[PDB]
């Protein structure tokens, strides 16, 4: 229903999973997709292939409003950081810019303990 000219991409990449969320400005969400959601269960859930598949589906779903410009915000480590953004352009979008949003504590809370695997 609502038509938005511009959008924002949020790519939350982790070792286990990757999530892509297409929103408008001010944070209201338009569409979202996840590697596990697009099949690819298990160790393959972290593969960059699932990342670009999820990016494709999410971008195609969000293309209904017809927004032609968006800015990418990438969070966290893990595969898909580049595959998802490549898929964003492949879908037909025009990315204004790409920026990083990784949270870096300034020596705050104590991390968990080692894994003696």
């Amino acid at each position: 229903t609502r038509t938005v000219s511009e959008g924002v991409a949020h790519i939350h990449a982790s070792f286990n999973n990757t999530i892509v969320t297409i929103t408008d400005r001010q944070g209201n969400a338009l569409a979202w997709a996840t590697s596990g959601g697009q099949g690819f269960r298990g160790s393959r859930k972290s593969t960059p292939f699932a990342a670009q598949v999820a990016a494709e589906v999410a971008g195609k779903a969000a293309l209904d409003y017809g927004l032609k410009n968006l800015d990418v915000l990438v969070k966290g480590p893990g595969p898909g950081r580049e595959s998802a953004v490549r898929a964003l352009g492949a879908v037909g979008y025009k990315i204004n810019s790409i920026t990083d949003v990784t949270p870096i504590p300034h020596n705050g809370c104590r991390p968990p303990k080692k894994r003696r695997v």
Partner: protein, 63 residues
């Protein structure tokens, strides 16, 4: 980061530039450290080992 794409900038080249900028910044490396808690003894041991390695590299350089 805040890399702005040029009018003729390819998306792949923009991604490459973003990767280079992130690598120079080193923000990604800091995240991996916060996964675990490093005890002070281990931290000091690693720092002294790194210092010894740097000095050895220097000596090899002017030698």
């Amino acid at each position: 980061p805040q890399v702005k794409l040029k009018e003729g900038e390819p998306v792949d080249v923009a991604i490459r530039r973003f990767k280079r900028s992130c690598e120079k910044a080193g923000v990604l490396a800091d995240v991996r450290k916060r996964e675990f808690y490093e005890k002070p003894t281990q931290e000091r041991k690693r720092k002294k080992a790194a210092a010894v390695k740097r000095y050895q590299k220097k000596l090899a350089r002017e030698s």
